[PDB]
Short mmCIF file of C-alpha atoms in Angstrom, two decimals:
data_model
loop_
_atom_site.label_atom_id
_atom_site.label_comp_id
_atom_site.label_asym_id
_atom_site.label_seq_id
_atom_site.Cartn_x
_atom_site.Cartn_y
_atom_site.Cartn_z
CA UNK A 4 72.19 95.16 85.64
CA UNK A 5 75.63 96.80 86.35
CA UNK A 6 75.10 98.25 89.57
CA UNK A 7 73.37 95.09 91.33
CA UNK A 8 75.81 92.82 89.94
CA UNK A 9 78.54 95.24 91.09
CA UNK A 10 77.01 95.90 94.81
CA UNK A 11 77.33 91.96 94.90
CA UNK A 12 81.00 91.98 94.30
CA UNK A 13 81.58 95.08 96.90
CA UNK A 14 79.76 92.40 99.52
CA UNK A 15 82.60 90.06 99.16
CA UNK A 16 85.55 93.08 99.20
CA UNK A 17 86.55 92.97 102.74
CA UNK A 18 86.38 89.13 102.99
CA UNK A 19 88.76 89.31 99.97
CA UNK A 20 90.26 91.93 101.62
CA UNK A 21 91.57 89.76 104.86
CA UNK A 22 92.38 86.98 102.64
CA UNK A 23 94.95 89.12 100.71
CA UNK A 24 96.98 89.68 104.37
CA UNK A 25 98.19 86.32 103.06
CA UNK A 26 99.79 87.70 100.07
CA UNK A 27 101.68 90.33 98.78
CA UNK A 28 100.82 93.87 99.59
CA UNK A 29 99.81 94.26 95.63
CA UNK A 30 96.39 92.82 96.21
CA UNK A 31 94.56 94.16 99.12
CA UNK A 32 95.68 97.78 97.79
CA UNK A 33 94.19 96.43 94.12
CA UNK A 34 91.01 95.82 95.89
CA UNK A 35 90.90 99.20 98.56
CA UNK A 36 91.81 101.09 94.93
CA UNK A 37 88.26 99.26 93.19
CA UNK A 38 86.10 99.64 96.66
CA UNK A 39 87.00 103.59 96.14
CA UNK A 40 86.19 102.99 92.60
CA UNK A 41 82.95 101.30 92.41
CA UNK A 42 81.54 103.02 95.19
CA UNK A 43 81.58 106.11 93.58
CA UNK A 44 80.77 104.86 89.77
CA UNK A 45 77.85 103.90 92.44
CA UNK A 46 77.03 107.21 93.65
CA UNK A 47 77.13 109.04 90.50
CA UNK A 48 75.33 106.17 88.31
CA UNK A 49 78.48 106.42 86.12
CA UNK A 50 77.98 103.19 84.16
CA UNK A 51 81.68 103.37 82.57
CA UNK A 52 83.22 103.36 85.99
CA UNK A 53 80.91 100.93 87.14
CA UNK A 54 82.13 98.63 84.35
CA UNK A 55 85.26 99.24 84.77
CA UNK A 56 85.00 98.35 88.58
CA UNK A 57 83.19 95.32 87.56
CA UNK A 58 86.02 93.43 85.77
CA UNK A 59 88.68 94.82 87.95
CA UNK A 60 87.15 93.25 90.80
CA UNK A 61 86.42 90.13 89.05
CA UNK A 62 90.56 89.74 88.08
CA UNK A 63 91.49 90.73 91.51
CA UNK A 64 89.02 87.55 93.52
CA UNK A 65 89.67 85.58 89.99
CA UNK A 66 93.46 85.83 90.87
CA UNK A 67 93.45 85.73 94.63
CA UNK A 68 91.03 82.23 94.40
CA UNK A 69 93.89 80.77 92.08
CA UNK A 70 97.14 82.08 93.79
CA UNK A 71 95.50 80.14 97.23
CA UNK A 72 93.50 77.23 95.76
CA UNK A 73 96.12 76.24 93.55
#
């Protein structure tokens, strides 16, 4: 369901987080901008937000992994 699979992806935010300092400044504020995001779609159970936080923090890792593996 949205909100477990979206907890998940906050778990792995600050590790992303650090490895962003590598990068420009565009993609740790991307992910501080979805942490603020999802964790309130959280608190208010708003299942648009917390969709919306889903895939943005899926791009963000999805683009960081590539920019460093690659």
């Amino acid at each position: 369901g949205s909100a477990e699979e979206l907890r998940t992806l906050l778990n792995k935010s600050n590790v992303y987080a650090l490895a962003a300092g590598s990068l420009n400044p565009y993609y740790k504020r991307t992910i501080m901008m979805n942490e603020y995001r999802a964790k309130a779609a959280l608190k208010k159970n708003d299942f648009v937000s917390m969709a919306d936080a889903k895939v943005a923090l899926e791009k963000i890792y999805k683009e960081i992994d590539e920019i460093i593996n690659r």
